[PDB]
Amino acid sequence: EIVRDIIIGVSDGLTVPFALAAGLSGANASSSIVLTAGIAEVAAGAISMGLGGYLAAKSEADNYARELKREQEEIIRVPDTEAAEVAEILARYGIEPHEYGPVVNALRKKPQAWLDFMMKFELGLEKPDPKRALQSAFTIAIAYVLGGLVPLIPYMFIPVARKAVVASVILTLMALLIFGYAKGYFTDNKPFKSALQTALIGAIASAAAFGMAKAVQSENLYFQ
């Protein structure tokens, strides 16, 4: 999870901060203009995922605990109505009633397990950790910033943008092929494929941002 949040968050700040930066460079914009947009974009990105992460986590933490309660109240007020819904669960998996019948009886004495299974199928069996909800957001905001920084560094040292964009194109394509392989070392296999696929989303968007940076600048003589 946190390994995914810090790598899935890096691959967003590596692509869009690069794509805009290259697009701005392509439309003959000054390094300084490429930074002001890019840093405005990185920070505006990190806040949006930072709070978006802790608005979904803090909403699902509340919702699944609230959904935990609503199903217990259905298990309590009308015990057979809740029994039938998970009798259906037992039934659903080709389990013939004369054996699962006694199961409900032991379940009616001990709440947790019977509940937990109906719960598993209602709330997805995902009772979450409250602290790791916050840790998900801070880790995704940080990794997203650190990935936006990578395409931007050269424009900080090189004030001709069409000079910097060549250093930026190689640095981040190196970074996309490194952090593409790392997103394949974990989770799904074939890390050389993931490397090339993150490099290719880079290219597609950096080229679209270039197509569109130029198209809006299309009547101006200099970048205005």
Q: At what angle do helices 161-185 and 191-216 cross, to 10 degrees?
A: 150
177 binds, among Zn ion, ligand OLC, its own copies, none (CB under 5 to 8 A by kind): ligand OLC
Tokens of 98: 């004369």
> Rounded to an integer, what distance in angstroms lies between the CA atom of residue 137 and that of residue 110?
37
| Beta strand extents in the chain (DSSP E only) | none
Q: Is 201 in the site for its own copies (CB under 8 A)?
A: yes
* Residues 191 to 220 in contact with ligand OLC, rule: CB under 6 A: 192, 195
Binding test (CB under 8 A) with its own copies, winner from 35, 141, 161, 165: 35
What is the closest distance, in whole angstroms, from the C-beta atom of residue 177 to ligand OLC in the complex? 4
How crowded is the C-beta side of 18, counted as CA atoms within 13 Å?
32
36 binds, among its own copies, ligand OLC, Zn ion, none (CB under 5 to 8 A by kind): its own copies
Binding test (CB under 8 A) with its own copies, winner from 16, 123, 137, 175: 16
Binding test (CB under 6 A) with ligand OLC, winner from 95, 178, 204, 208: 178
192 binds, among ligand OLC, its own copies, Zn ion, none (CB under 5 to 8 A by kind): ligand OLC
End-to-end CA distance of the chain: 44
99 binds, among Zn ion, its own copies, ligand OLC, none (CB under 5 to 8 A by kind): its own copies
**Cβ partners under 8 Å of residue 120, min gap 6:** none
181 binds, among its own copies, ligand OLC, Zn ion, none (CB under 5 to 8 A by kind): ligand OLC
Total of chain residues touching its own copies, rule CB under 8 A:
65
Neighbours of 172 (CB within 10 A): 27
Identity of the amino acid at 65: A
What is the closest distance, in whole angstroms, from the C-beta atom of residue 35 to ligand OLC in the complex? 27
Locus of tokens 């270039």: 210
Q: Is 119 in the site for ligand OLC (CB under 6 A)?
A: no
Quick check: 14 and 176 in contact, CB under 8 A? yes
> Rounded to an integer, what distance in angstroms lies between the CA atom of residue 199 and that of residue 177?
6
Q: Is 81 in the site for its own copies (CB under 8 A)?
A: no
Burial of 197 (0-12, 13-18, 19+ CB in 10 A): middle
82 binds, among Zn ion, its own copies, ligand OLC, none (CB under 5 to 8 A by kind): Zn ion
The residues of the shown chain that bind ligand OLC, judged by CB under 6 A, are 177-178, 181, 192, 195
